[PDB]
Write a protein that holds these residues in place. Sequence first.
Motif, PDB file in Angstrom:
ATOM      1  N   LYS A  78     -35.158  18.962 -33.408  1.00 52.51           N
ATOM      2  CA  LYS A  78     -33.709  18.775 -33.528  1.00 52.51           C
ATOM      3  C   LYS A  78     -33.144  18.856 -32.082  1.00 52.51           C
ATOM      4  CE  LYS A  78     -34.394  19.621 -38.032  1.00 52.51           C
ATOM      5  NZ  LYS A  78     -35.882  19.525 -37.848  1.00 52.51           N
ATOM      6  N   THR A  79     -31.859  18.552 -31.921  1.00 59.42           N
ATOM      7  CA  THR A  79     -31.219  18.615 -30.601  1.00 59.42           C
ATOM      8  C   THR A  79     -29.721  18.966 -30.760  1.00 59.42           C
ATOM      9  OG1 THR A  79     -31.504  16.189 -30.762  1.00 59.42           O
ATOM     10  CG2 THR A  79     -32.553  17.328 -28.876  1.00 59.42           C
ATOM     11  N   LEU A  80     -29.077  19.317 -29.647  1.00 58.32           N
ATOM     12  CA  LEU A  80     -27.657  19.687 -29.659  1.00 58.32           C
ATOM     13  C   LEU A  80     -26.893  18.898 -28.560  1.00 58.32           C
ATOM     14  CD1 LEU A  80     -29.690  22.159 -30.209  1.00 58.32           C
ATOM     15  CD2 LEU A  80     -27.641  23.605 -30.102  1.00 58.32           C
ATOM     16  N   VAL A  81     -25.636  18.562 -28.854  1.00 54.53           N
ATOM     17  CA  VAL A  81     -24.763  17.818 -27.926  1.00 54.53           C
ATOM     18  C   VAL A  81     -23.299  18.231 -28.226  1.00 54.53           C
ATOM     19  CG1 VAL A  81     -24.116  15.531 -27.025  1.00 54.53           C
ATOM     20  CG2 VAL A  81     -26.342  15.841 -28.177  1.00 54.53           C
ATOM     21  N   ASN A  82     -22.345  17.611 -27.533  1.00 53.39           N
ATOM     22  CA  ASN A  82     -20.929  17.896 -27.765  1.00 53.39           C
ATOM     23  C   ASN A  82     -20.408  16.930 -28.874  1.00 53.39           C
ATOM     24  OD1 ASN A  82     -20.100  20.053 -25.843  1.00 53.39           O
ATOM     25  ND2 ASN A  82     -20.712  18.562 -24.270  1.00 53.39           N
ATOM     26  N   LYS A  83     -19.744  17.519 -29.866  1.00 54.53           N
ATOM     27  CA  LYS A  83     -19.192  16.801 -31.016  1.00 54.53           C
ATOM     28  C   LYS A  83     -18.421  15.539 -30.548  1.00 54.53           C
ATOM     29  CE  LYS A  83     -17.097  18.199 -35.476  1.00 54.53           C
ATOM     30  NZ  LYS A  83     -18.440  18.377 -36.111  1.00 54.53           N
ATOM     31  N   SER A  84     -18.452  14.499 -31.381  1.00 55.45           N
ATOM     32  CA  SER A  84     -17.763  13.222 -31.102  1.00 55.45           C
ATOM     33  C   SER A  84     -16.220  13.456 -31.096  1.00 55.45           C
ATOM     34  CB  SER A  84     -18.118  12.182 -32.179  1.00 55.45           C
ATOM     35  OG  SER A  84     -19.515  11.931 -32.229  1.00 55.45           O
ATOM     36  N   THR A  85     -15.658  13.711 -29.911  1.00 53.52           N
ATOM     37  CA  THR A  85     -14.208  13.970 -29.765  1.00 53.52           C
ATOM     38  C   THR A  85     -13.424  12.632 -29.748  1.00 53.52           C
ATOM     39  OG1 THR A  85     -14.306  14.000 -27.294  1.00 53.52           O
ATOM     40  CG2 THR A  85     -14.514  16.137 -28.422  1.00 53.52           C
ATOM     41  N   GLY A  86     -12.095  12.747 -29.762  1.00 61.97           N
ATOM     42  CA  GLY A  86     -11.236  11.577 -29.705  1.00 61.97           C
ATOM     43  C   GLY A  86     -11.278  11.058 -28.276  1.00 61.97           C
ATOM     44  N   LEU A  87     -11.913   9.896 -28.091  1.00 61.03           N
ATOM     45  CA  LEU A  87     -12.081   9.246 -26.768  1.00 61.03           C
ATOM     46  C   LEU A  87     -13.350   9.849 -26.058  1.00 61.03           C
ATOM     47  CD1 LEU A  87      -8.271   9.422 -25.870  1.00 61.03           C
ATOM     48  CD2 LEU A  87      -9.552   7.236 -26.075  1.00 61.03           C
ATOM     49  N   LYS A  88     -14.495   9.210 -26.326  1.00 59.61           N
ATOM     50  CA  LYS A  88     -15.835   9.575 -25.808  1.00 59.61           C
ATOM     51  C   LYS A  88     -16.560  10.466 -26.869  1.00 59.61           C
ATOM     52  CE  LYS A  88     -18.358  11.977 -22.083  1.00 59.61           C
ATOM     53  NZ  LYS A  88     -19.238  10.869 -21.595  1.00 59.61           N
ATOM     54  N   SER A  89     -17.566   9.899 -27.535  1.00 55.98           N
ATOM     55  CA  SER A  89     -18.310  10.629 -28.569  1.00 55.98           C
ATOM     56  C   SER A  89     -19.763  10.909 -28.098  1.00 55.98           C
ATOM     57  CB  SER A  89     -18.321   9.832 -29.886  1.00 55.98           C
ATOM     58  OG  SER A  89     -18.901   8.545 -29.734  1.00 55.98           O
ATOM     59  N   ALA A  90     -20.567  11.473 -29.001  1.00 55.70           N
ATOM     60  CA  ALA A  90     -21.974  11.816 -28.728  1.00 55.70           C
ATOM     61  C   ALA A  90     -22.883  10.597 -29.061  1.00 55.70           C
ATOM     62  CB  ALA A  90     -22.391  13.035 -29.570  1.00 55.70           C
ATOM     63  N   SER A  91     -22.386   9.721 -29.929  1.00 55.07           N
ATOM     64  CA  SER A  91     -23.117   8.523 -30.332  1.00 55.07           C
ATOM     65  C   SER A  91     -23.410   7.676 -29.054  1.00 55.07           C
ATOM     66  CB  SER A  91     -22.273   7.709 -31.331  1.00 55.07           C
ATOM     67  OG  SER A  91     -21.864   8.507 -32.434  1.00 55.07           O
ATOM     68  N   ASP A  92     -22.375   7.480 -28.243  1.00 52.53           N
ATOM     69  CA  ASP A  92     -22.479   6.701 -27.007  1.00 52.53           C
ATOM     70  C   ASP A  92     -22.525   7.669 -25.793  1.00 52.53           C
ATOM     71  OD1 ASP A  92     -19.586   7.347 -26.165  1.00 52.53           O
ATOM     72  OD2 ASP A  92     -19.199   6.212 -28.013  1.00 52.53           O
ATOM     73  N   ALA A  93     -23.080   8.860 -25.997  1.00 51.05           N
ATOM     74  CA  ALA A  93     -23.139   9.848 -24.913  1.00 51.05           C
ATOM     75  C   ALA A  93     -24.471   9.743 -24.124  1.00 51.05           C
ATOM     76  CB  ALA A  93     -22.970  11.265 -25.476  1.00 51.05           C
ATOM     77  N   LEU A  94     -25.478  10.494 -24.575  1.00 51.39           N
ATOM     78  CA  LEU A  94     -26.796  10.537 -23.925  1.00 51.39           C
ATOM     79  C   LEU A  94     -27.685   9.312 -24.303  1.00 51.39           C
ATOM     80  CD1 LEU A  94     -25.817  13.377 -25.245  1.00 51.39           C
ATOM     81  CD2 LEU A  94     -27.146  11.835 -26.772  1.00 51.39           C
ATOM     82  N   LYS A  95     -28.739   9.566 -25.080  1.00 50.19           N
ATOM     83  CA  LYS A  95     -29.699   8.529 -25.494  1.00 50.19           C
ATOM     84  C   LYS A  95     -30.646   8.265 -24.286  1.00 50.19           C
ATOM     85  CE  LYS A  95     -26.654   5.315 -26.050  1.00 50.19           C
ATOM     86  NZ  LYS A  95     -25.451   6.010 -25.506  1.00 50.19           N
ATOM     87  N   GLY A  96     -30.064   8.151 -23.093  1.00 48.50           N
ATOM     88  CA  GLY A  96     -30.857   7.921 -21.897  1.00 48.50           C
ATOM     89  C   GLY A  96     -31.719   9.127 -21.571  1.00 48.50           C
ATOM     90  N   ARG A  97     -31.835  10.040 -22.535  1.00 50.77           N
ATOM     91  CA  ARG A  97     -32.636  11.253 -22.370  1.00 50.77           C
ATOM     92  C   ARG A  97     -34.108  10.958 -22.781  1.00 50.77           C
ATOM     93  NH1 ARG A  97     -30.652  15.784 -26.436  1.00 50.77           N
ATOM     94  NH2 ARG A  97     -28.758  15.410 -25.199  1.00 50.77           N
ATOM     95  N   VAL A  98     -34.924  12.008 -22.877  1.00 49.28           N
ATOM     96  CA  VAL A  98     -36.341  11.835 -23.211  1.00 49.28           C
ATOM     97  C   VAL A  98     -36.874  12.979 -24.117  1.00 49.28           C
ATOM     98  CG1 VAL A  98     -36.793  10.635 -21.045  1.00 49.28           C
ATOM     99  CG2 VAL A  98     -37.036  13.145 -21.175  1.00 49.28           C
ATOM    100  N   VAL A  99     -38.107  12.801 -24.591  1.00 50.12           N
ATOM    101  CA  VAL A  99     -38.784  13.780 -25.452  1.00 50.12           C
ATOM    102  C   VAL A  99     -40.258  13.929 -24.975  1.00 50.12           C
ATOM    103  CG1 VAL A  99     -39.544  14.357 -27.788  1.00 50.12           C
ATOM    104  CG2 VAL A  99     -37.375  13.120 -27.432  1.00 50.12           C
ATOM    105  N   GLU A 100     -40.457  14.688 -23.900  1.00 48.08           N
ATOM    106  CA  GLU A 100     -41.795  14.901 -23.344  1.00 48.08           C
ATOM    107  C   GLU A 100     -42.514  15.985 -24.194  1.00 48.08           C
ATOM    108  OE1 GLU A 100     -42.065  16.264 -19.116  1.00 48.08           O
ATOM    109  OE2 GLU A 100     -43.023  14.313 -18.768  1.00 48.08           O
ATOM    110  N   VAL A 101     -43.459  15.543 -25.027  1.00 46.56           N
ATOM    111  CA  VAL A 101     -44.185  16.456 -25.914  1.00 46.56           C
ATOM    112  C   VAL A 101     -45.637  15.943 -26.194  1.00 46.56           C
ATOM    113  CG1 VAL A 101     -43.323  15.255 -27.996  1.00 46.56           C
ATOM    114  CG2 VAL A 101     -44.128  17.662 -28.152  1.00 46.56           C
ATOM    115  N   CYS A 102     -46.477  16.862 -26.673  1.00 45.64           N
ATOM    116  CA  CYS A 102     -47.887  16.607 -27.017  1.00 45.64           C
ATOM    117  C   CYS A 102     -47.977  15.535 -28.146  1.00 45.64           C
ATOM    118  CB  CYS A 102     -48.535  17.922 -27.480  1.00 45.64           C
ATOM    119  SG  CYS A 102     -50.202  17.812 -28.178  1.00 45.64           S
TER     120      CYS A 102
END
Lengths: 91, 202, 25, 127, 63, 97, 214
Positions: free
Chosen positions: G26-50
């Motif tokens: 699972k992951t955590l981010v800042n709630k989709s506020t009025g003007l700039k949400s989490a949907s179009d926030a990160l994504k450009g992140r990664v998941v480095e795991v085994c």
Amino acid sequence: AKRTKKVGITGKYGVRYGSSLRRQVKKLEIQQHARYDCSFCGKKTVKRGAAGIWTCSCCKKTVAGGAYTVSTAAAATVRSTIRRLREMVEA
Amino acid sequence: SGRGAPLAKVVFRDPYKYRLREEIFIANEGVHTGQFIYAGKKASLNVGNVLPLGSVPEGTIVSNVEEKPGDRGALARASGNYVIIIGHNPDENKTRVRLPSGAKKVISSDARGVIGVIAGGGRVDKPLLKAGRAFHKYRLKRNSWPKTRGVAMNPVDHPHGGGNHQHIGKASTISRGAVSGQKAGLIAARRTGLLRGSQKTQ
Amino acid sequence: MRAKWRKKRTRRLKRKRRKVRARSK
Amino acid sequence: SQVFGVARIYASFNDTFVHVTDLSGKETIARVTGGMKVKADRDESSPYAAMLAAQDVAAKCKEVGITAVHVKIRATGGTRTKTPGPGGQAALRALARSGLRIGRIEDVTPVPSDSTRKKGGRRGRRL
Amino acid sequence: TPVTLAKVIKVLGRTGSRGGVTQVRVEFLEDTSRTIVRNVKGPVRENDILVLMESEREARRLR
Amino acid sequence: PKKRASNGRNKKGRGHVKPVRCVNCSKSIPKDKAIKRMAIRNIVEAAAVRDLSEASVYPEYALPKTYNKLHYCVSCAIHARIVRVRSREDRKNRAPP
Amino acid sequence: VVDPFTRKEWFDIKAPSTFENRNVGKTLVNKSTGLKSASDALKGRVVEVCLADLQGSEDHSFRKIKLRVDEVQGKNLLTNFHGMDFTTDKLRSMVRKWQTLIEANVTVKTSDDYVLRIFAIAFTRKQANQVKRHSYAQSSHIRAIRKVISEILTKEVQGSTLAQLTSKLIPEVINKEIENATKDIFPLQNIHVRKVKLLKQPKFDVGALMALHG
RNA sequence: AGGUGAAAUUCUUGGAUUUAUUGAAGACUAACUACUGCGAAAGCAUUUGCCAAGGACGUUUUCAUUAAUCAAGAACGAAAGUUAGGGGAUCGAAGAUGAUCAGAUACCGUCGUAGUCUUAACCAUAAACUAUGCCGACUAGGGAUCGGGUGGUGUUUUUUUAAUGACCCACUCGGCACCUUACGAGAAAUCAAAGUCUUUGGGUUCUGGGGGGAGUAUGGUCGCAAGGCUGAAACUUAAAGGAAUU
């Protein structure tokens, strides 16, 4: 015989303009002057005529060069860069 | 007559009427009287050959460049000075490039660029030696020389004038915010004194 | 007295006497 | 089945770091250091403090809901003393001591290619 | 305060500048199945129970 | 007087190796004279591995280690570390114990 | 006095398809506020795991597949392959004393214009009759090793893009296909694919992006 | 947060240090790295391409004394220093200061200019070490290891034994040092040479002669300089020094 020990084509500037300044001069001046070698015909007829230009004494191939030499260090670097990425546009 | 990097007189052919209207292309190290210069989007990369940056790759060198496809050249026209093509992007028509100064000024990927460096190489890397070659120099340029040092002129004729010794009087570091007559020396010096260390950027 | 130092002491005193004889060459 | 979240500790001298984040890292959750559990300096990279520090970051994740903790112990690395200090031990033991769910236990220091010259000098740091 | 009792099961050598401290290996009285190496002060025999006010810890060679 | 056959250390057959940086005072000492010391010790300390492969997911995973290389520079290694000096005779002793 | 978790809207992590237990974490981010949400926030992140924890077999106690979030279909993060690096703990055990190391690398495009640099480690070994305490290559031998290690990759790649490619990194076909051709040259030991990484991804192309997200 | 014996200077509601996806830049090429490789030496440790090159070896291949060492002289020669462009990440003479201290112009810490690196030239110096001339032959075995090579219906190779490759066994020159005694040699220390030297002579370049004065004065000579090279004397003193034992 031995006209100028270490002041070759600098005798035209006598003693004035200070030593160190002239040394730098000879290095350059000499370069551009010398009957330059024309890569085209192969005959060293390409002689520097006016800044950045080099006329051939046969076919008159006027070359695009430096202010005091046919090609500067970074000018030939141009050759490879081109030729390198030139084959990547056809192959 | 007043510039140190050959001017090629490339007589072109008019496709709108059987005619040869001679254009002008700054001369670049490696050309000569007989090279075949090709310009345009679909023109294979070669010295002299000119076309949009989006039409070339990273690293490619050029000079006498546009700013907006159509200003018939502009930047890197003087003896030698070339410019590299770094950051890119097909869409948006934008090519981040590097200039002589080392300016990371981003431009359109449709901006014309004459491939190759300007034939004028290592000029100021040679001493003018005598006052003369400086005279005859500007003689075919503009009467901008020989310039007189301010402290020499008297208080009337210039701000840096006067004094019983020869000194300026107040910091010759005029603010970029003065006016005609007020400005005279170091305008907007974000630094001053002998330059040493980290330069060009950060 | 570390020799490398005995060599620099004389280095300045040798360059010292080059300039005193230049004043009366 | 378990909510994951790497710990990314910083075993080194002078201080220990214990800020647990998510599998991505883009978003963190709690940080705290050892020096924060002691008023006297020196005992900053110390285990006693590294533990007291691992005790907080511990109770803090329990308050956010995550249970899984992938320890990515990291040594100063780069061009410095690359050896996990007296922190990555009493800090990793204070993690399972609290009751977190350790897993996929690995390391990730900044291993170079000798590259630049470390700071100090030829004779170096003599005394 | 998570209080824990310890039982002396392995008295080793001594450390410290003067060497008045001993490196003893004890096992918890309330759920042992594990041993921790703490230090001590004066005299100790492998049959004394101490009261460590520190749940997690350990110490060996001291300068 | 001369008291080292291999001299400082193995340099015979060549002229310039390349000095690696000390891992204690960062001092620069040639690869040969440099006293090597491998440290591949595990990731834990004492009975830590207990509550570790205990209060941990996976059976025990594999229990990873740390493979690092140390390089002291004489002075550093002779702090009571790796040496305790030697006897002229047994000075030429090449052994782990 | 706002407490981040007060706005921190949890999410999760879903693999592409080719893998197995897409359910990573699972992951955590800042709630989709009025003007700039989490949907179009990160994504450009990664998941480095085994890859073993995202496969199901803990035998692969090495090789951490790195991800790069693209679409966040209702909390569910539909991330795709962004590369595969090697665990330092395992690669540090691979470089022993008395042997030689042969590392290769090459950049290439798949079929849907996918540029990625695949790496490939390789080591030399003894035989069922070696006496000498060590083992080394003839340098020229290491040249044919690099000549073929890099050759192996670019030869049979561009096969269904990174799609079947990632589906070839898992079955370690390279590790054995490497030591298979390199048999008529030198023994070899380990011979892993080391790492690999994405540096030039085509278009967002949610067409082939959803062939896995279904 | 930095950092230390410990502090400090320092950085921090402007959110640092830390974490993360990235970007550019200069540099470097660790780990693999060895009582190992090649180079005349200084050295030279990433990849591929190119351009020549050198050594060993193998050779019933070739010329045929063409040769060995070498004052004058000629090329390359770390780093520092240097002239000028490009580049300037790290470190970092100088400097700034923070400390400890009696003081600290020191060592420890933080920043940081030349330098660092490259381009075209200079500069010719290191405990440039093998403190050990080059060339040859001989006086000794061992085992390694390195490059080529000889032979083993040998290991291993399965698509078929296809062929070779790696590997093991003896051999093998040329590398590389090492171990083992000393027959010898050495003031000892030690050494397959520093052996074949009072039983004193294989060719041969250079150098040194108590210690200081001094690699100085001087002049000459090369160099932009720094300084290189070349190199005294007067005078004074009976020890200086080596190796080793206590």
